[PDB]
Design a protein around this ligand. Structure first.
Ligand code: L9W
Ligand code: MG
Ligand code: MG
Ligand code: MG
Length: 350
């Protein structure tokens, strides 16, 4: 990788999120979104390292602090859509063509730390919050499908979550040092999703009733000893990190235990490997994988970018010295974008 370009957003506030739109065809514009301050900005990647500013969304609330964004598409037209959220605990769905807010969802008792769209169902949006819960939304019918949390749910702020490859299950993590598994392919969750598609408030005076999932399908506090701020699936395996200068690769149960045979009382975990690095011991630092899950990237607190081949390399620039909060690879993995605490954006080309 070579650093081909960089820019600084005029708001001068930290950028906490960056996502390339992976829902565009080959030959279509390479677009990425950044989120920082109360702003959402779209950029287009062109040849010879050129970055073109497309549009900017500025939230009506000046006190909003966007922490996360995630792309989807409208199933009927294939038109892209962008979901954003942060400190206000409000999810906003933005039309990226006009950069206008189409709709909003309220419900979480606090800030939203991460948003993820179901890998198969583009209408299924997952949010994780400081209120200790995860929420699954159906954005086609504007319904709250399920709330994951309660007694045996997270006991502190949820920082991250990820769906597995097929979207049959979710792994979540947070400030309680725990990683929790929630199956959404159960008869209960499959019926709840089916019911959310039939719901329409114009044909009934009764509200749609959300599933209250109080119990995870697996839980562990034996991987990390501090806030777990990033979790991703790698097939049936899990990649997770805390502020202990390591990304841990692990699985629930014993070495040969099938993840779909695991009982909720499973007390074993198996560590399969570790990706070690330096100076990334502050909270709220996200790692990312390319579409192919062949590369793993993580920025550190002094602007160094670590890249590992999943099938190490350190990317540095003398002008890049602020914490890299999040990175995103373009769908073809030819471009890696890093966003920083000083509102700076860095473009690395393969
Ligand atoms: C020192 S400072 O500049 O004043 C500052 C201020 C706020 C935050 C902050 C960032 N991000 C989130 N949530 C999203 C999140 C969650 C897990 C990992 C992760 C992210 C974003 C990048 O990596 N926050 C929730 N509460 N505060 C925060 C960090 C530093
Ligand atoms: Mg084996
Ligand atoms: Mg299976
Ligand atoms: Mg063990």
């Amino acid at each position: 990788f070579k650093c081909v370009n960089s820019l600084k957003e005029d708001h001068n506030q930290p950028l906490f999120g960056v996502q390339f739109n992976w829902h565009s065809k080959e030959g279509d514009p390479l677009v990425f979104a950044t989120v920082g301050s109360n702003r959402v900005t779209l950029y287009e990647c062109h040849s010879q390292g050129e970055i073109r500013l497309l549009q900017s969304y500025v939230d009506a609330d000046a006190d909003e602090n966007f922490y996360t964004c995630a792309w989807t598409y409208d199933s009927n037209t294939s038109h892209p859509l962008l979901a954003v959220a942060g400190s206000r605990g409000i999810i906003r769905i933005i039309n990226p063509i006009t950069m206008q807010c189409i709709k909003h969802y309220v419900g979480h008792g606090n800030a939203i730390n991460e948003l993820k769209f179901h890998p198969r169902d583009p209408n299924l949006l997952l949010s994780v919050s400081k209120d200790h819960a995860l929420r699954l939304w159906n954005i086609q019918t504007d319904t709250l499908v399920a709330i994951f949390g309660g007694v045996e749910g997270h006991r502190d702020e949820v920082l991250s979550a990820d769906y597995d490859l097929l979207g049959e299950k979710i792994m979540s993590c947070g400030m309680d040092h725990s990683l929790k598994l929630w199956r959404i392919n159960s008869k209960r969750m499959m019926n709840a999703i089916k019911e959310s598609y039939d719901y329409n408030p114009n044909k009934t005076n009764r509200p749609f009733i959300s599933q209250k999932i109080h119990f995870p399908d697996f839980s562990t506090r034996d991987i990390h000893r501090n806030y777990v701020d990033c979790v991703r699936w790698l097939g049936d395996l899990i990649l997770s990190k805390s502020c202990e200068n390591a990304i841990v690769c692990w699985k629930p149960g014993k070495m040969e235990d099938d993840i779909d045979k695991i009982k909720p009382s499973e007390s074993n975990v198996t560590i399969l490997g570790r990706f070690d690095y330096s100076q990334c011991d502050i909270w709220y630092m996200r790692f990312s994988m390319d579409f192919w899950q062949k590369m793993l990237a993580l920025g550190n607190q002094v602007g160094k970018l670590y890249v590992w081949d999943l099938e190490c390399t350190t990317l540095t620039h003398h002008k890049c010295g602020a914490a890299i909060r999040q990175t995103s690879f373009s769908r073809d993995s030819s471009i890696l974008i890093a966003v920083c605490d000083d509102a700076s954006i860095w473009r690395w080309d393969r």
